[PDB]
Structures are given as C-alpha cells and as structure tokens.
Design an enzyme around this catalytic site. Structure first.
Site, short mmCIF file in Angstrom:
data_model
loop_
_atom_site.label_atom_id
_atom_site.label_comp_id
_atom_site.label_asym_id
_atom_site.label_seq_id
_atom_site.Cartn_x
_atom_site.Cartn_y
_atom_site.Cartn_z
N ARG A 120 -5.91 3.58 9.64
CA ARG A 120 -4.65 3.51 8.76
C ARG A 120 -3.30 2.89 9.29
O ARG A 120 -2.81 2.03 8.63
CB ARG A 120 -4.90 4.08 8.02
CG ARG A 120 -3.57 5.44 8.34
CD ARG A 120 -3.06 6.31 6.99
NE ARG A 120 -2.57 7.71 7.35
CZ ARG A 120 -1.25 7.30 7.31
NH1 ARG A 120 -0.60 6.67 6.09
NH2 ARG A 120 -0.39 8.30 6.61
N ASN A 121 -2.97 3.91 11.12
CA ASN A 121 -1.52 3.61 11.41
C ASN A 121 -2.22 2.72 12.66
O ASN A 121 -1.06 2.67 13.28
CB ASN A 121 -1.23 4.73 11.68
CG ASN A 121 -0.47 6.05 10.28
OD1 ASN A 121 0.29 5.18 10.22
ND2 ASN A 121 -0.49 7.04 10.27
N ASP A 141 4.08 3.80 12.61
CA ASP A 141 4.17 5.42 12.13
C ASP A 141 4.38 6.21 13.23
O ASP A 141 4.26 8.11 12.45
CB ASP A 141 3.56 5.58 11.17
CG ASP A 141 3.61 5.30 9.78
OD1 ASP A 141 4.55 5.41 9.33
OD2 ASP A 141 3.01 5.74 8.68
N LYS A 185 9.62 0.13 4.15
CA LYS A 185 8.80 1.78 3.81
C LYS A 185 9.62 2.20 2.98
O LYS A 185 10.87 3.14 3.77
CB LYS A 185 8.22 2.87 4.94
CG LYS A 185 7.46 3.45 4.55
CD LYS A 185 6.59 4.44 5.82
CE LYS A 185 5.47 3.83 5.53
NZ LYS A 185 4.49 4.64 6.91
N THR A 243 5.77 4.45 0.02
CA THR A 243 5.52 3.20 -0.22
C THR A 243 5.44 2.23 0.63
O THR A 243 6.26 1.64 0.75
CB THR A 243 5.14 2.67 -1.63
OG1 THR A 243 5.06 4.64 -2.55
CG2 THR A 243 5.12 1.95 -2.47
N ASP A 287 0.17 11.68 13.91
CA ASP A 287 -1.21 10.95 12.41
C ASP A 287 -1.29 9.65 13.21
O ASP A 287 -1.56 8.73 12.68
CB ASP A 287 0.31 10.93 11.76
CG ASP A 287 -0.52 10.43 10.70
OD1 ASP A 287 -1.95 10.80 10.65
OD2 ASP A 287 0.16 10.52 9.51
N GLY A 347 0.64 -1.22 -0.06
CA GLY A 347 -0.19 -0.55 0.17
C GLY A 347 0.87 1.36 0.04
O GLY A 347 2.50 0.97 -0.36
C1 LIG Z 1 -3.85 0.67 5.90
C2 LIG Z 1 -2.75 -0.17 5.03
C3 LIG Z 1 -1.80 -1.55 5.95
O1 LIG Z 1 -0.99 -0.38 5.41
N1 LIG Z 1 -1.56 -2.80 4.92
C4 LIG Z 1 -1.36 -3.33 4.96
C5 LIG Z 1 -1.85 -4.90 4.23
C6 LIG Z 1 -0.59 -5.67 3.64
C7 LIG Z 1 0.40 -5.77 5.22
O2 LIG Z 1 1.02 -6.75 5.20
C8 LIG Z 1 0.77 -8.07 4.29
C9 LIG Z 1 0.33 -5.52 5.94
N2 LIG Z 1 1.84 -5.52 7.08
C10 LIG Z 1 1.86 -4.19 7.23
C11 LIG Z 1 2.03 -2.55 6.62
C12 LIG Z 1 2.89 -1.65 8.04
C13 LIG Z 1 2.81 -0.40 7.12
N3 LIG Z 1 1.85 0.48 6.97
C14 LIG Z 1 2.44 1.49 6.59
S1 LIG Z 1 1.03 2.47 6.64
C15 LIG Z 1 1.18 4.03 6.61
N4 LIG Z 1 3.23 1.77 7.19
C16 LIG Z 1 3.93 0.35 7.86
C17 LIG Z 1 5.54 0.27 7.86
C18 LIG Z 1 6.23 -0.29 7.18
C19 LIG Z 1 7.74 -0.55 7.56
C20 LIG Z 1 8.41 0.91 8.25
F1 LIG Z 1 9.81 0.17 8.68
C21 LIG Z 1 7.17 1.65 9.47
C22 LIG Z 1 5.98 1.39 8.46
C23 LIG Z 1 4.24 -2.33 8.62
C24 LIG Z 1 3.95 -3.53 9.18
N5 LIG Z 1 3.56 -4.85 8.43
C25 LIG Z 1 -0.17 -3.66 5.65
CL LIG Z 2 2.78 7.13 5.08
#
Ligand SMILES: *CCC(=O)Nc1ccc(OC)c(Nc2cc(-c3[nH]c(SC)nc3-c3ccc(F)cc3)ccn2)c1
Ligand SMILES: [Cl-]
Ligand SMILES: *CCC(=O)Nc1ccc(OC)c(Nc2cc(-c3[nH]c(SC)nc3-c3ccc(F)cc3)ccn2)c1
Ligand SMILES: [Cl-]
Lengths: 314, 301
Positions: free
Chosen positions: B142-143, B156, B46, B26, B138, B20
């Site tokens: 979604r977080n 986040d 990310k 991203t 934030d 996402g």
């Molecule tokens: C709503 C959006 C979303 O996060 N969806 C989503 C869909 C499938 C997934 O795994 C199967 C995960 N897992 C996940 C997400 C994240 C993450 N999401 C965000 S949204 C701004 N940001 C992060 C993230 C990732 C790595 C980092 F170092 C910091 C922040 C993190 C871990 N597992 C999510």
């Molecule tokens: Cl973000």
C-alpha cells in the site's frame, strides 16, 4: 523507429479546444492506455491539409525527424495518428505559448526572464542547426512555456510538411508568416539556418515589446518592398542599444553577415548576468527569478527533464 | 538543504478529490495554483488525522526536511508542507495509484516481467534508504506507488516513527526495534502481497496472535505463481535471526537476475503476451509522464 508512437483513434480523445493557427487547431486531449484505468492529459494538434499529395510514408518520414529532436528547449513529437486527418500528440504545456504569456503578464515581467528566454530559444535553435534542421516558422507564438523559467520551441518541420499555396504569400495574414521571414525567403522561398536567425530577431522583438505585432498596419504584400528600402522594426522602449544592435544584425540582407545561433547564446547569456544594464524596466528590482525553494518545487512537480540552469544576475 | 521543502499557504492549493485513507491520514487529489498565474497543477495532498500544537509542529517540520531530502527514482520525495491546525503534506501525484490496489485490479493481467521488475525497483529504493542509514518502518504494498506501470516508488518514508503487525519482523513486535533488517522482513511480505496479487497476509489470524505463530515457525504460504526460488528468498526475509536475512543489495542482484529469465521463476497463465512495453511504448510513457532519470529496467535475455 521507437521514438514515434503510432496512435489509433480508440486510445485518445480530444477534450477541449486550446487554440487555432495556420497549421491547425490544438486540443487538450486524453490518452487512455491499453488496458489501464487512467486518463493522461496530452496536447493534440489536428493539422490542416498539406497543399501536396503527401504520401503517408513521407508524412511518417518527416514525423520521425520531428520525433528525433532531443533538447531541453525544443518540443519533441511523441505520437501520430494518420486517419482522415493528421493528428500529432506531445506533452501538454499548461502555461500556454510565450506570445500569450508576455501579453498577459506585460506589467509583471522583468529583465531576467526576458533575457533567459532569449538564451533558451537560441539554445534550442542552435540544437536544430547542429542537427541540420531548419524550423521555417520561428515566432513567439511557436515558443511554449513549460514553466515560466523553461521555454521550448514547438512546431518545427510543420511549414515544410504542410507547405502553402502561392496565394498566401501575396495576401494578408494567412498561412505564410511573411512578417517573420527573411527577405530571401519572401522573394525566393529560400529557407536556411540564417533566415531562421532573421525570425529569431523578430521573435526577440515580440518579447521585448511584450507581444506587439511586427509591422502592424503595413500590408503583408508590401513587406518585401520596405525591407529592400531598408526599413526594419523599431527599437522597443525597454531595449538598450546593445540589444537593438543584435536585433538589427539578424535582419541584414546578406544572410551570412547575420549572427550565428551559437554566438547569440553567448551574448544573451552575458547580458543575463547583468540584466539591468541591457533592459530598462521600471520596477525591475521588484521582479526576480524564482528562489531556490520555488524552482525545486516547480521542477519536482512538472519539469523533471535535464535542463541547464537559468542565467542569473551576479 | 532547507530549499527542498516548500512551505505552502492554504490560499495556493485546494483539495479536490479523496483518493484514499491510511493509518497516517487521508490522501487527496489537489490543485496547486502558483501566485500570479492562472494554471492549476495537480498534486497529492496528505492530511494528518491528529491536530498538532506549535511545539508538535516543530518536531514534524524538522522530520519533513529529511523526507524532502530523499532523492532517488524509486523513493518519493516530500515536496511541501502546510502547517495549519492539522498538517498537510504535498508531493507529486502518481496517477496510477498504489501498487496494492493496482495488482488487485489487474489480478490475471500482470506478466512476470512486471512483478519481478517491481521487486527490483522496490529493493533499489530500500537500498538507497539503507545507504543513507534511514529506516522506513512501514514498507508494504500500500506504500509503493505506481508512477507508470514500468516505474514504482516507495512512499510514506519517515511517517511511522514520526507520528502493521502482519508486516513487522518478530523483533519489532516484541521489542519495538526497527532496523534495515526489519525493513527486509516487510520487503518479503510486500513481495508476497505482489505475488498473490494483493492477498491479505495471515488472513483471519488476530494481530494479538501473530507473535506466537511466528515463534512456532509458521510463515506465509508459497504463492501459486512462485517457483521455489522466489519463495525461498521470501522465506529468508522472515528468519528470526535478523542478520541472516538477505541484504537489500543482494535482493537487487537476485531479482534482477531473475528478471532476465522471468518465466522460469514465475509461472503465470497466458504469460506469453504480457511483456513489458516495446521501446516505442516506453519512450512515449517517459516523455509524456516520467522524464526523471532512472536506470533501465531488467529485460529478458
Ligand atoms: C493504496 C492507496 C492509494 O494510495 N491509492 C491511490 C489512488 C489514486 C492516486 O492518484 C490517482 C494515488 N496517487 C498518489 C498517492 C499518494 C499517497 N498515498 C498514500 S497512502 C498512505 N499516501 C500518499 C501521500 C500523498 C502526499 C504526501 F505528501 C505523502 C504521502 C501520493 C502521491 N500520489 C494513490
Ligand atoms: Cl497512511
Ligand atoms: C501561442 C498559442 C498557444 O499555443 N496557446 C496555448 C493555450 C492553452 C494551452 O493549454 C495549456 C497550450 N498548451 C500546449 C500547446 C501546444 C501547441 N501549440 C501550438 S500553436 C503553434 N501547437 C502546438 C502543438 C500541439 C501538439 C503537437 F503534437 C505539435 C504542436 C503543444 C503542447 N501544449 C497552448
Ligand atoms: Cl498552428
């Protein structure tokens, strides 16, 4: 009660064969929980069949025991599905088994790892003894690598669950680990904590030889005879006498003169604080345990359970 | 503690799938490959949107050390960083995704025990940040990430001021002031997101106008499944006076009490079947996927 989940075939699928042994075949699997959209990786063992008309209630009775072990160095049985086959589920260990591991990293494995694995196996066996459980099939193939810094004993209770015919005692490479068994287990099917200690001795020998086969070339039907003549596995090249003496103490004919697991924890932990004095390995200074940054990273991703620190060189 | 943040090299990880996007960048599913091994360990990556110079990376790196220092079962810890041209952050993958998209996908199949326990866990996570004098800036559905359906974690943290009008407190919109009490405001909006199963707050109202309708006292409406005791809590988080909004400590206690009588505070069709898992199911989840230590969740009386 709650420590053991009863699976149905609808909620998991075998995805890929990982390995085959005397107790069954292990598959990488996927658990697909009720009403969710995720696939969770799991390890699935489909057992061969027990030589006894085993009632399901007593298969489940054994499995609840297996589901009750709670220790950082023994793998806990998580789930079971009883259909035409008996299928056991537990956490997948992507690093594989410790016997395959020491073979594949023969040239890059130092004393600190080898000695810490000794300690952790002894800790896991000491737990089983305190719970009054006998493993019966302790071997390097039955130690799994969760991380290179964290090993766990698997497959306990399966020897007594599946049993074995009498033909596989008097036969080569079958379902009975003759070359890992104490003499009393070979001769009389006697399994105690002290003959687990014998198997621990053979397990340490596998590690210190980086995965050599014990008594290679000597037919299994003859092992009982050479043990009574006094023959034992030879001193691995990297072992000082201190380590070899412990190994031979584990293979003594009189069970109660073997070491106890609790004693083995203490002596292998002592040796791990000065590993270069007890194992001689070339390039050993170019091989260390992970740094703190690397262990914190390994633990946060893949190994979050409570665990005692590895024993480091002072 | 500089040993809580691993500096990754590009050679030891790879982006596999896009999961996402976000205001901050991203999100990818990735594979870490330790040096000398042959395993492939899933991670979340990310990638930030804007490219950064060495001087800009220094400010990012020291902020990352703080993110790597959060240690709480309901706040996600930053695990690594790779300072390329375009920065990449690495943490543990949460396979059930984000709670916002989770409640949208499971609209009429989420019981009251889950919703109220998610509000307890989110409050616990924010209270930890407050205890460490850390402002999220934030907080939103979604977080909040789903490790298991029984276990959620705020993600986040620290990204906002490092690098959402309809989630922000009035004082933050007008004067760019962010406090723990402004985090409490967005907690109320987050709870509103959960209770409406992921509706968009203030839908069809332009962001330029949110200032002015809040001044006039307009607030998000009572979600249909909420009793007035749940809605009053939410309403207290959106009072203009920041210091008479609830405190995160008080929210833990309130929602935990409600989590023990879940059907008197949320009215859900078919709720007589969506109980949280038995001990058996919950033991399975944790040994398989969630071995970190966390206090029990508030089950019913
Ligand atoms: C709503 C959006 C979303 O996060 N969806 C989503 C869909 C499938 C997934 O795994 C199967 C995960 N897992 C996940 C997400 C994240 C993450 N999401 C965000 S949204 C701004 N940001 C992060 C993230 C990732 C790595 C980092 F170092 C910091 C922040 C993190 C871990 N597992 C999510
Ligand atoms: Cl973000
Ligand atoms: C030493 C032989 C071996 O097991 N190698 C190996 C190769 C690839 C793998 O996937 C990453 C694993 N992971 C694994 C294996 C097991 C397991 N191994 C055995 S051999 C005696 N038996 C089991 C097992 C599996 C499921 C159960 F419910 C009970 C016992 C377990 C977890 N991960 C290993
Ligand atoms: Cl096997």
């Amino acid at each position: 009660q709650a420590l053991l989940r009863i699976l149905k075939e609808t909620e998991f699928k075998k995805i890929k064969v990982l390995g085959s042994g005397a107790f069954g075949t292990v598959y990488k699997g996927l658990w697909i929980p009720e009403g969710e959209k995720v696939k969770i990786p799991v390890a699935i063992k489909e057992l061969r069949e027990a030589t006894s008309p085993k009632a399901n209630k007593e298969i489940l009775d054994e499995a609840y025991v297996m589901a009750s072990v709670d220790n950082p160095h023994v793998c806990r049985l998580l789930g079971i599905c009883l259909t035409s086959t008996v299928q056991l589920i537990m956490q997948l260990m992507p690093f594989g088994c410790l016997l395959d591991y020491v073979r594949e990293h023969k040239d890059n494995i130092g004393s600190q790892y080898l000695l810490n694995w000794c300690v952790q196996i002894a800790k896991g066996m000491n737990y089983l003894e305190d719970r009054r459980l006998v493993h019966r099939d302790l071997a390097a193939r039955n130690v799994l690598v969760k991380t290179p810094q964290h090993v766990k004993i698997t497959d306990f209770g399966l020897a007594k669950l599946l049993g074995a015919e009498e033909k596989e005692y008097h036969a080569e490479g079958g379902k009975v680990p003759i070359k890992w068994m104490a003499l009393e287990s070979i001769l009389h099917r006697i399994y105690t904590h002290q003959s687990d200690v014998w198997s621990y001795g053979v397990t340490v020998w596998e590690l210190m030889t980086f995965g050599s086969k014990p008594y290679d070339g000597i037919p299994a039907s003859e092992i009982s005879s050479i043990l009574e003549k006094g023959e034992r596995l030879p001193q691995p090249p990297i072992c000082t006498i201190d380590v070899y003496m412990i190994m031979r103490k584990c293979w003594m004919i009189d069970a109660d003169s073997r070491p106890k697991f609790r004693e083995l924890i203490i002596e292998f932990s002592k040796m791990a604080r000065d590993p270069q004095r007890y194992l001689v390995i070339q390039g050993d200074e170019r091989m260390h345990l992970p740094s703190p940054t690397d262990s914190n990273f390994y633990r946060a991703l893949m190994d979050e359970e409570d665990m005692d620190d590895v024993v480091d060189a002072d």
